[PDB]
Amino acid sequence: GAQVSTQKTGAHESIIHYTNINYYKDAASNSANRQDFTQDPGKFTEPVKDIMVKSLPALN
Amino acid sequence: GAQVSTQKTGAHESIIHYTNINYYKDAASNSANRQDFTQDPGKFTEPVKDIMVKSLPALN
Amino acid sequence: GAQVSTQKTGAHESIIHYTNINYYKDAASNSANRQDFTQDPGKFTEPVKDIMVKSLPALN
Amino acid sequence: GAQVSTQKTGAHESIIHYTNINYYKDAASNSANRQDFTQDPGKFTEPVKDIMVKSLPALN
Amino acid sequence: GAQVSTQKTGAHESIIHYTNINYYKDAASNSANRQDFTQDPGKFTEPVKDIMVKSLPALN
Amino acid sequence: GLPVINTPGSNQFLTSDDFQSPSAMPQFDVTPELNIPGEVQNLMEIAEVDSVVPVNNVAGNLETMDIYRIPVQSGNHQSSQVFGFQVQPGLDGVFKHTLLGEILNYYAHWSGSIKLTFVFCGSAMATGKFLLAYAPPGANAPKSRKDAMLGTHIIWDVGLQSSCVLCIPWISQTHYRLVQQDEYTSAGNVTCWYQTGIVVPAGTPTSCSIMCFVSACNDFSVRLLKDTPFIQQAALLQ
Amino acid sequence: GLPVINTPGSNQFLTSDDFQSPSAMPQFDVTPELNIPGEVQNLMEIAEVDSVVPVNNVAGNLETMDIYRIPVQSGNHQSSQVFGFQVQPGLDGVFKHTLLGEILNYYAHWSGSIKLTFVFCGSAMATGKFLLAYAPPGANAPKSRKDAMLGTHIIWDVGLQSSCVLCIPWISQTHYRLVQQDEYTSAGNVTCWYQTGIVVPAGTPTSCSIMCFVSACNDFSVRLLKDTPFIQQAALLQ
Amino acid sequence: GLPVINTPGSNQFLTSDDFQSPSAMPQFDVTPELNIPGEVQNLMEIAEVDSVVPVNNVAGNLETMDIYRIPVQSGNHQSSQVFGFQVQPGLDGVFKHTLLGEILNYYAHWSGSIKLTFVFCGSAMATGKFLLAYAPPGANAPKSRKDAMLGTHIIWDVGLQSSCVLCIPWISQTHYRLVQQDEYTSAGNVTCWYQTGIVVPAGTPTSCSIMCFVSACNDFSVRLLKDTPFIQQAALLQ
Amino acid sequence: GDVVEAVENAVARVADTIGSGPSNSQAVPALTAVETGHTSQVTPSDTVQTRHVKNYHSRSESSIENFLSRSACVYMGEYHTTNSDQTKLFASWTISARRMVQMRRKLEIFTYVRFDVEVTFVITSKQDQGTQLGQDMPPLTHQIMYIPPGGPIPKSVTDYTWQTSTNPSIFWTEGNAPPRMSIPFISIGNAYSNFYDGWSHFSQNGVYGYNTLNHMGQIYVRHVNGSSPLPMTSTVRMYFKPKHVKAWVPRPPRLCQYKNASTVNFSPTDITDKRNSITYIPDTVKPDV
Amino acid sequence: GDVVEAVENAVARVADTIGSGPSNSQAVPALTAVETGHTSQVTPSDTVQTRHVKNYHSRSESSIENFLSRSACVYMGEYHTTNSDQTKLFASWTISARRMVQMRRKLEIFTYVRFDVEVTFVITSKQDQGTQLGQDMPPLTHQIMYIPPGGPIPKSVTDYTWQTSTNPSIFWTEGNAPPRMSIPFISIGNAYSNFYDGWSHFSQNGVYGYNTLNHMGQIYVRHVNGSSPLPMTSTVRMYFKPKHVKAWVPRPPRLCQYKNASTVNFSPTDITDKRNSITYIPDTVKPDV
């Protein structure tokens, strides 16, 4: 009971995917999640209550 | 003719399963049943005929 | 093009089978037929024409 | 994308076949055609125009 | 999730193909594209605007 | 030949691995299973069973039935605390060789509530009330009944129901504590006091014994298998 | 036995490989995840945060809060340039130990626009306009306001909005530049000039400080992981 | 463990193998492809392009532009053959360093028709007809125009169309010839003769040059890769 | 998604540059108030005229997983095949990632981290220097044993303790691929803690910092052939590759060098390198001065 | 199609010979004007009477992929197990395909090329010559480490730098299959450039040519056992097999021998070999003269 997902694209602008099967009983044995790419800068660059529209003054 | 079942959950709150195929003719050759988790404390903690409701006296 | 058949039962009163694929071009290369269990004692213990009912005399 | 064909029959008058998959890009890499058994003695034993019925004289 | 394509034809005028599965996460790991055979001599042998019909003079 | 790469780990022997292996006795016909009473399935079934706690594990009682008897008596002894002990189920002498304790010692982590059952063994004409208290960590052991009653406690009235259960609820910063407990995974103590002395009519013994049983509640579990400190040898023919 | 051929690479240990491996603790029950605030997911989230630039990294300020203060003052100083520095985010002292810089140093390639925020810290009664210019490579640093204004620039008017943002758009022959920058991947410089001096009423300080913050814009990325030059050791027990 | 047998070949390193291999740079983001003009796809695209043949490769011309000039002139020279050469595209000096020749030298087999384009470079007032002949193998090179015209040939009339194409059709017992040609894979010769002398008016040069270009036709192919004899070294830092 | 799975699509594209023209208004994007604690969201198009650019650049290699997931040496030690010291016959340490800096500074960029770990060991042996050097020692087989806190500790290369009836052990022979295994997230807490501004004792004393939170046991490694006519010595190197990662509350990268393993101690160090003046920009572009 | 995929049909057949008969017309295919810069498209059937031939010949082996995709030695160096020089204890070079000619001339047929590369290493060791030759050294294990431009460089076989917390390294033991790995298209630009008629400095000076464009880092390789009673020496050979290729603007094949690695420098050399006269054609076919 296998999974097929896409490969990271290389040297050019269907054969661009790979297949994987897990052979172990523990999730710890699995390979790394190198393909997950989320992001949320907000937690850090903009943790202000009161939304700053910035195109407007920011004070006044 | 293989079997797919789930892995013991690890480091986080579909890819959480594994596949297995038996290659030998004797059940003795198979791997351990580390995933069976039944339980029946009763045989030992409460082997009394006459059900003890315990919220009630227990004697009287 | 494989075959699935059952394992000889072990240490207890679906995962009790195995799968096999033959990789060679000659039947001689195959494994042994350890699972065939026919029997015909008659050839030897009772090779008499004239059926002996034995609960009856056998002579007379 | 594999092929299943029958094995050469051995020591006795479904499990009498094998499966094969080619792993190389050139036909030269494949195994031998030990199972092809055609025949045409005629080219050599009877290369005469004018069919010889032989049960008839052959001359006359 | 595999691919089947044909082999380069060898020593003779269905078993003439092979199967492949990619096991790596990067396209760089894949084998070479030895089977792609395009061609465009034109870029080099005939880079003239004004189509030369050549069966006609070419000047005049 | 199918192409293959051996990964680190190839050819090692890991004690806790879990692979298939060829049988050295092909087709052996095992003898039929028989339905024997008392089948065990999880060591917790054993830890959930009461076993007697050697509360009076004082020098000199280590090999006599006394270690199991908590002394209590008639007359004015209120100031006098009846007993007290740390709550380290897998480590302190009071618990380590208990059914629950022996089991905890095959693991490195534990979590759950514990039941302490106290049974009065004086004459039927004897009477009395005790205060059983459990203090979560952070302070030293209560030194008086006043201090002890500020924590978790039951007031036990001796009567026809010979036994009383003090349940130690799981209160901890972490989900688990080391069986080999340290201060970081401290669990507190339980102490016992006369709530109102032991009164008795004439013709009856003026002192008796209280016994204490321990067992795990149903929210109890253990993790991380390890060997027990309790068994050893100097040579084979063991 | 299934036929197999081992390929080059078999049995090697590549630091950055990515394979499955047997667990040495079969069925270990990991402790439940807890939702902690502040989860980080990509180092760029950190590089997108402003951090203070040590623009005044002159000998003698290396360990004092001055390295962070750009000196500016009342009176006629137009000819006098306020400051200037190269745009080598991962290499020049001005940037390398910055939040953006420390991150760039774990990589060999970078690309993207950069934000330079300047904040005025004089009294509220202070006044003034500055010219902030960025010059793409190819010529030497502007030596006068005349030369500087021929490049990319904002004219900043000090007012209630204490801060002004000079954004350095990505202008390069290549899609990426070396973090360990060379002349081939030069990025130019930014210089600052009085556009119209600092004027002030009586009773207020005649000189103040301007601070400078740097952060990456949203078109910024980095590639090719490598170790940082910044940390080291002579022996273990590290 | 799945049963396996290693076959001969296991662990060898074959220069021309073709297997998958782990990447030492997992997830590297390659720079975007750019559409550059002039993409080459098969070395035959190069061999199909005309290049100048050094027909006059006589001692003393090896490093001068003459090696490329075939001398032809006014007056009676009919008996005099203009030039001749063997058809060994990958081997004879006349062809080996040609665009077609350099390419053939990276292979061991070739097959196909060849185009020889001849261009007249005299004055426009010059006039003349030549006979260009190709003789398949089996006899010695024609020694007179009589003998040469019995084979494949074109009669070229100098005019406004400065160039004439002699195409050498593929005539061979075998489908392929060795690039390193032997007598068994002989291909014959081409020779050139005055069909009717070069006539010229007064005031114009009485002698001029004819150049010769070679290129492969569309039925041309090569096989069996090998190294070129043409490049070498005595040591590294190459 | 589920941060335990070895597969998961989606390209991490950066932002396109929006085409921008001339402007005359009250919009004042380039003027903000840094005091609010907010980082400005200005892009080139807010301050200069920009063309449109379809940007394909991705942030794949700066994802926390790809940043930490590379094996790093976190420890190395030696042990001898033969010696009079008994002690020198086996190696042992206490698990932590605080003894080699590279790895340590990487982890310390985050206050808390949670992950599984792929441990790989590289073991090598050399023959010790001496007057007589000829011997024919068969292949060396080693035993690596993990002792969770509280387990009995070996006192000699031949202690009963190496029986590992329960501790997990690895037996490996030289010449083969380096040994390797995965370890799950093993903490008592919900995330491994890289910093702890606290004490072990409730009375605000005892041990301060990271150490009070550690306690992950130790590793013992010894030879199993146990002998060699002439002295030899082996070195064991252990590598950690975290995988299936999660990180919280980022902090500045360590600036001062590390002084020891148990503390965060440091000596005052420079904010950065000096340069000549606040206006100094070297002159490149000259007929070479 | 997609030039990254390891599969893709279609036979590369050459042209059939069209059957041709006699002709008398104004068609004059054999007369063109080479001045236009166009190469004539004449085939045999335009100038002689031809039969029809169904031609099955294919150009498969002259496709750019099949021409370049064969491992080639691009470098070789030595290093010793033991020596007084420290330097001689490890090998190191700067990645380029300019030090071995065969490979270099092949690549230089194209001005620009783009591709992934399969690198294979062949390592061998020999025991150095000497008076005493008896020893029993266990198997040698080597470490190959790649240092991208800008990374710290090893200064001895025991430098901290070999920790490779981040540089990619390969550990391999003798007797096993040669080590191998794929490297992606690593350029800063859109295609690797084989020639560069330019400078490094904007003032049209500095370094000229290929070198200014290089900078792909270097490789360091050392033994890991680190010792041997008697001296030994190893040779490391590196092979490149480009794969997933694309090439642009073909140029003539290098005619003069190469003089060094950093330049295109050459000495004047002959256009081709001489022969007796412009009419000389040797006489084969004689009762042997």
What is this structure, in a nutshell?
Chains F, G, H: It is found in: Host cytoplasmic vesicle membrane; Host nucleus; Virion. This is part of a larger assembly, with five copies of chain A (60 residues), three copies of chain F (238 residues) and two copies of chain I (289 residues). Chain A has no helices and two strands.
Radius of gyration of chain A: 21 Å
CATH architecture of chain I: Sandwich
Number of helices of chain I: 4
Question: Largest chain-chain contact?
Answer: G-I, 110 and 108 residues
Q: What percent of residues of chain A are in strands? A: 5-15%
Q: In the CATH hierarchy, what is the class of chain I?
A: Mainly Beta
Assign a percent range to the helix content of chain A.
Answer: under 10%
Number of strands of chain A: 2
Look at the helices and sheets of chain I and give the structural class: mainly beta
- Assign an overall shape of chain A: elongated
CA-to-CA gap between the ends of chain A?
Answer: 62 Å
- Helices and strands of chain A, in order, run as EE
Number of domains of chain I: 1
- State the end-to-end CA separation of chain I: 58 Å
Please tell me about this protein's structure.
The PDB classes it as virus/receptor. The structure is cut from a larger assembly and holds 5 copies of chain A (60 residues), 3 copies of chain F (238 residues) and 2 copies of chain I (289 residues). Helices cover 0% and strands 13% of the residues of chain A. Chain A has strands at 3-6, 17-20. A two-stranded antiparallel sheet of chain A has the order 1-2. Chain A is elongated. The N and C termini of chain A lie far apart (62 Å). With 238 residues, chain F is mainly beta. Chain F has one domain: Jelly Rolls. In chain F, strands 1, 2, 5, 8 and 11 form a 5-stranded antiparallel sheet that branches. A 4-stranded antiparallel sheet of chain F has the order 3-10-6-7, with no helix packed on it. Chain F is elongated and about 95 Å long. The termini of chain F are far apart. Chain I has helices at residues 44-47, 64-68, 101-107, 210-213; strands at residues 31-32, 72-80, 90-94, 110-127, 141-147, 169-173, 180-183, 192-193, 218-223, 232-250. Chain I has one domain: Jelly Rolls (Sandwich). The longest helix of chain I has 7 residues, at 101-107. In chain I, the strands form 2 sheets. In chain I, strands 2, 4, 7, 8 and 10 form a 5-stranded antiparallel sheet that branches. Chain I has a 4-stranded antiparallel sheet with strand order 3-9-5-6, with no helix packed on it. Chain I is 7% helix and 27% strand. Chains H and J meet through strand 1, helix 1, strand 4, helix 2 and helix 3 of H and strand 1, helix 1, helix 2, strand 2 and helix 3 of J. Strand 1 of chain H pairs antiparallel with strand 10 (232-250) of chain J, so a sheet runs across the interface.
